[PDB]
Amino acid sequence: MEKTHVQLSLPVLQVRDVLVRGFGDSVEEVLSEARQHLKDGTCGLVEVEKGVLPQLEQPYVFIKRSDARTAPHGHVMVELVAELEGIQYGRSGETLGVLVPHVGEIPVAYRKVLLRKN
Ligand SMILES: Nc1ccc2sccc2c1
Numbered sequence: 001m002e003k004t005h006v007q008l009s010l011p012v013l014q015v016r017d018v019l020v021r022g023f024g025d026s027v028e029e030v031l032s033e034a035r036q037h038l039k040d041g042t043c044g045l046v047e048v049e050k051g052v053l054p055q056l057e058q059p060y061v062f063i064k065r066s067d068a069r070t071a072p073h074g075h076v077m078v079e080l081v082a083e084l085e086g087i088q089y090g091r092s093g094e095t096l097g098v099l100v101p102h103v104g105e106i107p108v109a110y111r112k113v114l115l116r117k118n
Contacts, residue, residue: 075113
């Protein structure tokens, strides 16, 4: 049925190219839509630099590194943590980026992850 982890290659997008700048309007919604878009292959990743977060829509969904030992074929193990008004629901490791819908924008790279589905 549903393995706990799935290997994915996510398109990395520059923030100014992103057309849909968040997944929804609550913490529960953004996590739910992030997971659906991951399942459908319509999820992109924006790497965080200065000025990136203010250009995206809260609540944010981050992918964070969940394990230090495991990266099969560079698929870094990650889990999802959401943020609303400065509070994060969950705790994990280093932030690898912020997830956004992908609607056909051209990426600058692909990031390989081993995603904890829940
Ligand atoms: N195949 C696939 C890819 C990503 C995700 S996220 C939750 C379920 C799921 C399934």
